[PDB]
Amino acid sequence: TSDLIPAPPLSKVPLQQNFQDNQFQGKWYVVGLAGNAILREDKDPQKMYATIYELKEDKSYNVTSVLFRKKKCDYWIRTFVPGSQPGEFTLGNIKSYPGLTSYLVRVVSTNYNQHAMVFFKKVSQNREYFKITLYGRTKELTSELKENFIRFSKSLGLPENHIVFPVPIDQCIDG
Numbered sequence: 001t002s003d004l005i006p007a008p009p010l011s012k013v014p015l016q017q018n019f020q021d022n023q024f025q026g027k028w029y030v031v032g033l034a035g036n037a038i039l040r041e042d043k044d045p046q047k048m049y050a051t052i053y054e055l056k057e058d059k060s061y062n063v064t065s066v067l068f069r070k071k072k073c074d075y076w077i078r079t080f081v082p083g084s085q086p087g088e089f090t091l092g093n094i095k096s097y098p099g100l101t102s103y104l105v106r107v108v109s110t111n112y113n114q115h116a117m118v119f120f121k122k123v124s125q126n127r128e129y130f131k132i133t134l135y136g137r138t139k140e141l142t143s144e145l146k147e148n149f150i151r152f153s154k155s156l157g158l159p160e161n162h163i164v165f166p167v168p169i170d171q172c173i174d175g
């Protein structure tokens with residue numbers, strides 16, 4: 001059994017105009033998380049993690065994320081394949097992920113050197129999940145940008161308790 005807030009139609013998710021793939025490369029800190037599977041948790045609050053975007057020769061991204069868990073750095077890797085338009089992607093080697101039938105990424109907005117908002121949508125075990133990530137080039141962002149991310153998340157149907165701002169750490173993510 002599972003009850004999820006429905007995924008928004010793609011019409012409600014903007015696309016970053018004139019997307020420059022080479023400028024989006026590098027490390028981003030996850031300063032905000034929102035989604036239908038994301039829950040606020042004051043007992044064990046979400047720790048900040050990082051995601052590195054590297055363009056390959058064929059213009060796909062090698063996306064490597066690192067998080068601090070159980071006193072160790074856990075790495076996980078995926079391939080974002082360019083989609084129907086620039087700033088859009090699908091997942092490479094989807095068959096290597098048990099239960100996964102669909103995976104979409106859309107870059108909503110970015111200035112490339114400070115911040116970015118990225119929309120994800122996937123179907124896993126026939127359940128449709130979506131999330132929005134607030135990327136920061138630094139671990140801290142302005143209140144204006146964080147409130148913008150909150151209202152965009154709310155526009156896609158998510159309540160406050162489905163929006164989290166991970167706490168900055170130094171382990172694993174400063175590399």
Ligand SMILES: Cc1ccc(O)c(O)c1
Nearest residue numbers: 037120121122129130131
């Ligand atoms: C929780 C969640 C929602 C959507 C995604 O695309 C994903 O990777 C994770």
Ligand SMILES: [Cl-]
Nearest residue numbers: 076077078097
């Ligand atoms: Cl993964």
Ligand SMILES: [Fe+3]
Nearest residue numbers: 076078120122
């Ligand atoms: Fe994922």
Ligand code: NA
Nearest residue numbers: 068069070071
């Ligand atoms: Na832990």
Ligand code: NA
Nearest residue numbers: 141142143144
């Ligand atoms: Na401020």
Ligand code: NA
Nearest residue numbers: 027173174175
């Ligand atoms: Na750093």
